[PDB]
Amino acid sequence: MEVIELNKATSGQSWEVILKPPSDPSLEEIQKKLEAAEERRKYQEAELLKHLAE
Amino acid sequence: MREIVHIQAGQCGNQIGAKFWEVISDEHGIDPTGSYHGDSDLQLERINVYYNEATGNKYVPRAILVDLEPGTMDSVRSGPFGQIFRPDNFVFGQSGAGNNWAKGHYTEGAELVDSVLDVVRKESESCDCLQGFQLTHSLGGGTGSGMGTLLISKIREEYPDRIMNTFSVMPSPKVSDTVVEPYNATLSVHQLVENTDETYSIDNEALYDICFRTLKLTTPTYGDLNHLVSATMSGVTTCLRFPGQLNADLRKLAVNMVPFPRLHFFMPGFAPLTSRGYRALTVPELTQQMFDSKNMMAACDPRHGRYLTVAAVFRGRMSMKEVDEQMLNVQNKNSSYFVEWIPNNVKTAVCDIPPRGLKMSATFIGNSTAIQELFKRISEQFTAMFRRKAFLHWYTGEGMDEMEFTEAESNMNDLVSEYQQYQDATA
Amino acid sequence: MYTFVVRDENSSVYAEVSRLLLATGQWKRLRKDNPRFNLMLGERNRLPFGRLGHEPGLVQLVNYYRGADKLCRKASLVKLIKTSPELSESCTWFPESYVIYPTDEREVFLAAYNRRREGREGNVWIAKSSILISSEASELLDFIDEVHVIQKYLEKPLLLEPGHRKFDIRSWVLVDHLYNIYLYREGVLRTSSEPYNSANFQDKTCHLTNHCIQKEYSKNYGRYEEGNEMFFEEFNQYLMDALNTTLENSILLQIKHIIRSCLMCIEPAISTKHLHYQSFQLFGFDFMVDEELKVWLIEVNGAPACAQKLYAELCQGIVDVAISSVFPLASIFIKLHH
Amino acid sequence: MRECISIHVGQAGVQIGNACWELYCLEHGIQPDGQMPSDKTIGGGDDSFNTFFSETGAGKHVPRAVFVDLEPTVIDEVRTGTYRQLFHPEQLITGKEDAANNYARGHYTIGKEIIDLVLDRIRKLADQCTGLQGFLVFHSFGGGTGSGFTSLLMERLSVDYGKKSKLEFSIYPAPQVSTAVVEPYNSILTTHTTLEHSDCAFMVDNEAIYDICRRNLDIERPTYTNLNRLIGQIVSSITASLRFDGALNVDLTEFQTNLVPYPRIHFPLATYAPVISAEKAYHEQLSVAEITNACFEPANQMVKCDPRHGKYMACCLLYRGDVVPKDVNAAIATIKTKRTIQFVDWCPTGFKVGINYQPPTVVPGGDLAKVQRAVCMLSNTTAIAEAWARLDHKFDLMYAKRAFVHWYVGEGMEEGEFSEAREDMAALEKDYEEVGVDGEE
């Protein structure tokens, strides 16, 4: 069982212990999707208001 | 989301609407003058949901009283709490609707409707954040039925983004003898399916049978029925009036209760069932009772259908462990009556303040497919008259056509077909 | 009123287990996709182990141990025996086995095979998928290219007389939620109704003692017993009258040592002791007995079936000690201590 | 010195945040008025605590935190709180109307209208930073704000600070405390949207937390208060290394480095021991060996799963209090033989260890007892995929019927976004299975 990289400090201590060895969208796209949803909502509200006026 | 605007239309609406304010006023420690005189500050934390605070720290209900006749509203004004209500908020006519949906919706109601909306508008202004609307009414009359649904439609046009919720009273031939009631009720359901977010199906058949068979009242009165309605209304609104996690607003309630937009008709339940004249109930008793057919406010057998969603509210000082134990026991003992394709569809709330004269109660709210039974009933009665076009002259004499009736008939039959769809649906 | 779900319709054993549970009138069978159950009688392959133990108010138990496939898959069993120090390559009761892919054990297989040819030792082997019996390395390796395990073929087996017939002992073991290893008192001998051919290995009738190959490729099937089923009381009588010893002394003792040593080995990897859900499992241990009365382990079956006369007793033992222990209402086993 | 900005989204993020910043103050000797006697450099410093706390010339130690809920009630209790003096009024951001447990209303509708004000209040903090490390984002998976608004903020943070680390503390939904039936939908939707923008996410299944409190703290019906004091302990173990002169996980990059081999599989499993009730008069003090062993007990994990039927790609032990390496390495020898710890073939079976002399701290008047030694084990195991398989199945049961879908579509979301988000989850599950593994008779 190996012990490596023994790091010491004032409020701690650390080491590794080997038991065995081995074997994004831009702001433009964000507003595009945020506007398309608002426009899908706005269409649904106006279609309702159209039906209510009927 | 914060403030709820309450509207009460017609004889039934104003009677049950009145009893509602009397019950929750006492609950929130508000006297018939509007002055607060309570023992807990839990009573005021969410007071502004239903009450407008006025100069001199007096609380005014955010209530609009509508009718096409002065009668009931005059007795409400003469009543114990009539003094609490804003007098500018009493909007009435002199004609009457004569138990005619066509009169309430198109002819007589048409003449009064804008004066109501001006009061709705004024109330909506004094709102930091309006949640939506609450309406009390019967579906069997003319005013609450015809005018109530026209008011919902008009409110929806001006406030399309807000939540519309109703306490709708369903007709029964055990309570009423007005032949035209199935017609008015079918015309009103068609409207409710399209324009409401949540409807508490309060059935006069179930209220009558509870009074007769369980409360052993030989000759039940409207006040006897209304006693069960005011208990149900106090229970189903608890989460909106008192601090809490579950269903604390109209929208959160709708998202938990409405899987499909037309399937928003709730079967309310209540335990213990009482008459207006000691012995506390255990958490296991409250749970057996609230889910029992005999405790349902709609004349449907829940065991004939499946629950799509359930909300359970426990009021008083009890064990949250035992509430949880019994709620899980009910679900685990009868798992076939709860759709498998809506996981964890039963949500529970516990509120420390009980109702008046009860140490502990339980209110159930169920979106069961068994509500189709109530709709099949009104449909059986409607079709029997409509296939012979009987009593239609009362409606056509107001400008309506047979088409509106055929359409209403179809929509309700389609709604019954939808409830069956999800009763026979498997995962 | 406890609840269960049936997710393996093909299991004869849990079909009888289901039948007996309903018959008590304290168990209800839910839809195979209803989560509000106490007991899952799950599907053989790909059981959703990760989903169990997440239903509050319900004590959940399954008829399978997650990871018991290390002992039940042919190539995995060999690997478990070879790597685990608890069993190791220094294991007397299991035949010489090598995992061959068409990682690999091809190099070490030739190494041990060629030491036997020049060592003037019998070089008969067997091939099976996780069926071939040959003496040459060509016929074995060439066949896998048409994943398998090449195991030492039992050249000198014990033979029942009259008949000069081969056999195999199937023992049923139930490991409950507490890891108590229970051996059912009744076992069966899957006999070969045709006499054993010392030199001929082409005819796969006298070499494969399976109940399927005897009802298909054997002419004299059902001659000595019914069909090729010898039970323990009968087999013990043959051992006393024809060999002096008893079944308990010459065979059962070694069988028990094998069951225990196998199941104790994987207890730290499959035990459901401090788990959100509990497991139990019925296993079918398959043994070969040589002429020197020495017991050898052939395979472990995760989903065994029973002998038609024993279903009644075995399936009642399952509900008694594995189910009603966890779900109490209103011995036919030998507890293997560890 | 490198700074960290903590962001608390929704009710869960804000209430946990509160429980954390309260523990931080007890731990660093900072008072409810924002005063720290132990800090001798007035109105500044390059100390290890300054990673989380900014300073004023008056001597106020101010959390580098942003609180965001779309409704006032919750944040108005940070304003009425014991630690009300600590926070600047512009650190607390509220809407009027909440996301109604709807991801679409939180992401699209209310999100679009408050995103810019939030990023503004975040830059107001980022501009007080000499060298900002990144963000710690606290939120629920289930709530509408918690899921919808967080996923939107994560995409924008990736834009505005592409070089910075984004770490998560996510509350996985559990029916015992669940406020909504749509929590499976919201969880998958935010997971799919936040995947590319998260470097390391720590999941806390509310069911595990509720059970630890029932079992180990003997609480009949645990509240959010109980749940959060416990979450606060695990969060403190993970961040102690950034707030104090430590040797391991000294910066947010180290978490990705030491725990995340593949970027999609960035969900380490957190185990914490010992959990003891303060209401216990007698307490037998557990050894390093005892508390180390307990890190391999499913009863102590933040998500219930079997790490035995999976593989390890990373494992790291974070000790606290009276702990010496001698006892640690001996416990690591002991457990290796007892427990079945399988690692990925291409990884060395080994552990990264860290001790932080700083003693385990508790809230005076709590359900949790003061311990001499403690340990948090962070391990990247493929066994965590069990939480994904559970949530994905719930999502599937509901989606097959399009139950509640209209609520999403009504807020502008397309029905196709649901199955897109789900295909990513089916991909994520497939990745975990690739890494994790190799009739009648």
Ligand SMILES: CC[C@H](C)[C@H](NC(=O)[C@@]1(C)CCCN1C)C(=O)N(C)[C@H](C[C@@H](OC(C)=O)c1nc(C(=O)N[C@@H](Cc2ccc(N)cc2)C[C@H](C)C(=O)O)cs1)C(C)C
């Ligand atoms: C002789 C006919 C009686 C009156 C009537 N019978 C029927 O309708 C029958 C049974 C007869 C033929 C078939 N049909 C269905 C009846 O019992 N009902 C219509 C009752 C309601 C009736 O009962 C009695 C016994 O009077 C009424 N109750 C009230 C009442 O509760 N009044 C309260 C005030 C009130 C007034 C109107 C409204 N809409 C609401 C409330 C005052 C009383 C003191 C109280 O609090 O109970 C008035 S009429 C319903 C519930 C079945």
Ligand SMILES: Nc1nc2c(ncn2[C@@H]2O[C@H](COP(=O)(O)OP(=O)(O)OP(=O)(O)O)[C@@H](O)[C@H]2O)c(=O)[nH]1
């Ligand atoms: N542990 C813990 N879980 C919480 C807390 N508050 C809420 N939750 C859980 O988080 C989920 C619900 O999300 P919430 O945070 O309440 O919702 P929100 O982000 O405010 O979103 P909306 O209110 O819908 O706008 C459920 O699983 C709750 O049980 C908390 O303080 N602690």
Ligand SMILES: Nc1nc2c(ncn2[C@@H]2O[C@H](COP(=O)(O)OP(=O)(O)O)[C@@H](O)[C@H]2O)c(=O)[nH]1
């Ligand atoms: N439960 C209950 N039902 C009532 C009450 N008043 C009227 N109803 C019922 O309502 C229907 C008649 O409607 P009503 O409200 O009187 O007429 P409207 O004034 O034209 O809306 C019938 O089904 C009555 O039995 C009441 O106070 N309580």
Ligand SMILES: Nc1ncnc2c1ncn2[C@@H]1O[C@H](COP(=O)(O)OP(=O)(O)O)[C@@H](O)[C@H]1O
């Ligand atoms: N190494 C072997 N030596 C002798 N006989 C063997 C050997 N391996 C298997 N057998 C014979 O083959 C039969 C079937 O083998 P088995 O491994 O049990 O396969 P299965 O999974 O199809 O039941 C046994 O009943 C036995 O007669």
Ligand SMILES: [Ca+2]
């Ligand atoms: Ca007129």
Ligand SMILES: [Ca+2]
């Ligand atoms: Ca300083």
Ligand SMILES: [Ca+2]
């Ligand atoms: Ca990134």
Ligand SMILES: [Mg+2]
């Ligand atoms: Mg009237």
Ligand SMILES: [Mg+2]
């Ligand atoms: Mg019943």
Ligand SMILES: [Mg+2]
């Ligand atoms: Mg909230």
